[PDB]
Amino acid sequence: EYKLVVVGAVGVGKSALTIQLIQNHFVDEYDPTIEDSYRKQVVIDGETCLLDILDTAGQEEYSAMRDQYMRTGEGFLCVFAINNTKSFEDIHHYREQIKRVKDSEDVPMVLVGNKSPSRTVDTAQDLARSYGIPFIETSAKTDAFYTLVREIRKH
Amino acid sequence: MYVKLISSDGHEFIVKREHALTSGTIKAMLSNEVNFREIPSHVLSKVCMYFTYKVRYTNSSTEIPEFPIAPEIALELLMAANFLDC
Amino acid sequence: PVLRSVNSREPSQVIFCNRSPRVVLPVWLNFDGEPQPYPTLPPGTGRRIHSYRGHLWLFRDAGTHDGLLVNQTELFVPSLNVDGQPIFANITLPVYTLKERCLQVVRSLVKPENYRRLDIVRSLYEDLEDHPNVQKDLERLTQE
Amino acid sequence: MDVFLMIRRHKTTIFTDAKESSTVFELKRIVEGILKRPPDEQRLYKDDQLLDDGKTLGECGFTSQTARPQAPATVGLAFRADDTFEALCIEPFSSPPELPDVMK
Numbered sequence: 001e002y003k004l005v006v007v008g009a010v011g012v013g014k015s016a017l018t019i020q021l022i023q024n025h026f027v028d029e030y031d032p033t034i035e036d037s038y039r040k041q042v043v044i045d046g047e048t049c050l051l052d053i054l055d056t057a058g059q060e061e062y063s064a065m066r067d068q069y070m071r072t073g074e075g076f077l078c079v080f081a082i083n084n085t086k087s088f089e090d091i092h093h094y095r096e097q098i099k100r101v102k103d104s105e106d107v108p109m110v111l112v113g114n115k116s117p118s119r120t121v122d123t124a125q126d127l128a129r130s131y132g133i134p135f136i137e138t139s140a141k142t143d144a145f146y147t148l149v150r151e152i153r154k155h
Numbered sequence: 156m157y158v159k160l161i162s163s164d165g166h167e168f169i170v171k172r173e174h175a176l177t178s179g180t181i182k183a184m185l186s187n188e189v190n191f192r193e194i195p196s197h198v199l200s201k202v203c204m205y206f207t208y209k210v211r212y213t214n215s216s217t218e219i220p221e222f223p224i225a226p227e228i229a230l231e232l233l234m235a236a237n238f239l240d241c
Numbered sequence: 242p243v244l245r246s247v248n249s250r251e252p253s254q255v256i257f258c259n260r261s262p263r264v265v266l267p268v269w270l271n272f273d274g275e276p277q278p279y280p281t282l283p284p285g286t287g288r289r290i291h292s293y294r295g296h297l298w299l300f301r302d303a304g305t306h307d308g309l310l311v312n313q314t315e316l317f318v319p320s321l322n323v324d325g326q327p328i329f330a331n332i333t334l335p336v337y338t339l340k341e342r343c344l345q346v347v348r349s350l351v352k353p354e355n356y357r358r359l360d361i362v363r364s365l366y367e368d369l370e371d372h373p374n375v376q377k378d379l380e381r382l383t384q385e
Numbered sequence: 386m387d388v389f390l391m392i393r394r395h396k397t398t399i400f401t402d403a404k405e406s407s408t409v410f411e412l413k414r415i416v417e418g419i420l421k422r423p424p425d426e427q428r429l430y431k432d433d434q435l436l437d438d439g440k441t442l443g444e445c446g447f448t449s450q451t452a453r454p455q456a457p458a459t460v461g462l463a464f465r466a467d468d469t470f471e472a473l474c475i476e477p478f479s480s481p482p483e484l485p486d487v488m489k
């Protein structure tokens with residue numbers, strides 16, 4: 001069982017991007033207000049697999065309970081988008097709070113740029129390199145979390 | 156300017172006076188030469204090294220180095236530091 | 242609780258630098274003033290960490306909770322970040338007293354059970370048993 | 386940059402500091418202030434190699450990382466008995482006890 005935890009600003013598409021993997025069918029309007037665990041039974045690179053993808057949602061809460069919840073996230077996808085840039089400014093805060101809950105600098109992780117017309121932020125491919133993490137240039141409209149699943153294995 | 160702390164076993168150590176005033180028991184005993192009778196040379200030499208360290212690194216702005224204490228002398232220096240209030 | 246971080250939510254970028262030979266445990270004093278532990282830094286390591294205006298931090302040896310100094314003082318509260326430049330916190334060893342250093346090394350070599358098996362005067366057994374814990378310093382510090 | 390030293394003769398050991406650029410001659414003047422014996426009457430050694438007055442502490446081997454406050458460098462000293470100089474004799478410190486069981 002591999003527990004994954006997608007994370008971002010309200011509007012990035014974590015709620016949607018989960019639907020393509022779990023249900024392979026886009027939901028254009030989804031409620032951005034509720035988080036559930038989508039368990040899956042998918043062969044990955046030839047293995048027994050049962051993901052437990054958390055679709056994070058809600059108002060931020062720095063509490064004991066919520067820290068220990070996301071600390072169980074075996075891996076995170078920090079989702080940002082290109083329509084917005086506020087997104088690309090929250091991306092550091094999320095990354096750093098994942099290091100706090102996980103008590104380490106090195107946590108399986110993946111920056112993800114979504115919605116690829118506005119293009120506020122050019123491919124920061126460079127930023128991801130400093131983060132020491134990959135990039136999937138995802139498009140839920142047209143989706144690789146396997147990109148992230150490598151890191152966790154390496155761990 | 157200079158004072159002589161003398162170990163139990165006859166060794167004589169001439170350390171600056173300001174350096175030996177780092178010790179409370181020495182600060183009073185000097186109110187010149189002192190004679191410590193339960194402190195062997197190898198403990199007092201070590202004590203005189205601490206005098207040098209505290210005086211040089213006290214009120215420093217950047218990194219200070221660790222004061223090394225070997226495992227063989229640890230017990231004797233503790234008691235001597237207790238006796239000498241430093 | 243007078244010693245406590247002020248919840249200001251305004252970001253201040255700081256650089257923790259371990260110019261000590263010990264593994265530093267950055268300790269954050271939270272909104273109610275309770276010491277809250279953060280990821281350790283290995284000797285020689287500098288990391289760019291993200292704090293906020295007014296937060297209080299103290300720095301200790303992760304293993305034995307021995308006390309360390311930050312910018313030559315005991316507590317670190319990030320100053321104003323000027324034009325987005327990092328605020329530097331230089332964590333360093335303090336000049337321990339000869340007695341406290343000897344207690345640090347004897348606790349080092351010997352299990353706590355056998356402190357009483359050591360041929361020392363009883364006062365030293367109480368001293369070796371009185372380890373440093375962060376909370377006692379806070380109260381001491383709080384008074385001043 | 387200072388070098389921290391222990392000038393040693395018989396059971397006399399002096400803790401003083403000096404600049405790495407200080408000359409060996411100048412070092413003998415500092416001992417003259419304390420032991421009141423002239424530079425012509427002092428012979429300074431590093432280990433058993435004899436030092437020359439015009440060389441500087443640095444050039445003899447005493448350097449900031451070899452002569453630290455908490456671990457100083459030993460400079461040997463021998464005095465002049467009339468026509469000839471005595472042999473360098475530094476008497477050691479006492480040995481320490483057997484490391485207790487509980488500690489090892």
Ligand SMILES: Cc1ncsc1-c1ccc(CNC(=O)[C@@H]2C[C@@H](O)CN2C(=O)[C@@H](NC(=O)CCCCCN2CCCN(c3nccc(-c4noc([C@@]5(C)CCCc6sc(N)c(C#N)c65)n4)n3)[C@@H](C)C2)C(C)(C)C)cc1
Pocket residue numbers: 007008009010056059060061062063066067070090093094096097098099100101104105248250257267269279280281282288290291292293296
């Ligand atoms: C590497 C290292 N080596 C040695 S030390 C070290 C190290 C490592 C990491 C750090 C990181 N820095 C800190 O910990 C600093 C240090 C200290 O000063 C306190 N402090 C803090 O942050 C503390 N905060 C503050 O006082 C003020 C914070 C104000 C933020 C304001 N907001 C406002 C709204 C917009 N936004 C916003 N909107 C929506 C969601 C989020 C969000 N965000 O996350 C998360 C997630 C879910 C992401 C997954 C992991 C976690 S876990 C969880 N509990 C999470 C949660 N809900 C999250 N969702 N956000 C934020 C972008 C901005 C606190 C303790 C309360 C968290 C520091 C040092």
Ligand SMILES: Nc1nc2c(ncn2[C@@H]2O[C@H](COP(=O)(O)OP(=O)(O)O)[C@@H](O)[C@H]2O)c(=O)[nH]1
Pocket residue numbers: 008009010011012013014015016017027028029030031032033057114115116138139140141142
């Ligand atoms: N252009 C574009 N829009 C997207 C994409 N994925 C999601 N969206 C839209 O962006 C919004 C994101 O909604 P949702 O996934 O609930 O956001 P979250 O709750 O922050 O994950 C919705 O209106 C989606 O229809 C994508 O790949 N491209």
Ligand SMILES: [Mg+2]
Pocket residue numbers: 015016030031032033034057
């Ligand atoms: Mg949603």
